[PDB]
């Protein structure tokens with residue numbers, strides 16, 4: 001039911017187990033791993049200490065045996081991250097990615113993670 005996380009940067013987080021498809025709809029960890037690399041400069045810059053967790057919880061969501069669904073981030077965390085990191089993307093010609101639209105997440109804990 002609940003496969004371990006083969007993706008490198010999400011490794012020693014709060015949680016160590018996942019279940020595809022993720023909150024982007026993709027079925028393969030190798031895909032998520034690829035789509036995470038695009039954010040490495042953003043992580044390097046440190047616009048938000050919650051960015052790594054937030055991104056991991058989206059692309060490689062928490063799986064527990066007790067729950068049937070993948071557990072992503074609470075909208076609140078997303079908002080906080082977006083507030084800190086969206087300006088960094090805009091100054092370089094980009095925007096907040098659609099796949100990270102805070103509307104597609106539950107507000108507070110529907111169950112979700114709120115932080116580390």
Ligand SMILES: CCCCCC/C=C\CCCCCCCC(=O)O
Nearest residue numbers: 038039040041042043088089092094
């Ligand atoms: C996903 C967020 C991206 C963060 C914003 C990008 C930051 C700097 C962009 C500089 C682009 C130049 C890349 C250098 C190319 C090279 O060194 O070969």
Ligand SMILES: *[C@@H]1O[C@H](CO)[C@@H](O)[C@H](O)[C@H]1NC(C)=O
Nearest residue numbers: 004011012013014015016017
């Ligand atoms: C992560 O998984 C290991 C086993 O793979 C487990 O022992 C550990 O409790 C998990 N993490 C946390 C925070 O419990």
Ligand SMILES: *[C@@H]1O[C@H](CO)[C@@H](O)[C@H](O)[C@H]1NC(C)=O
Nearest residue numbers: 096097098100101102103104
């Ligand atoms: C976020 O989701 C809402 C609700 O579906 C949608 O109206 C909105 O267009 C999405 N975000 C963007 C930037 O389009």
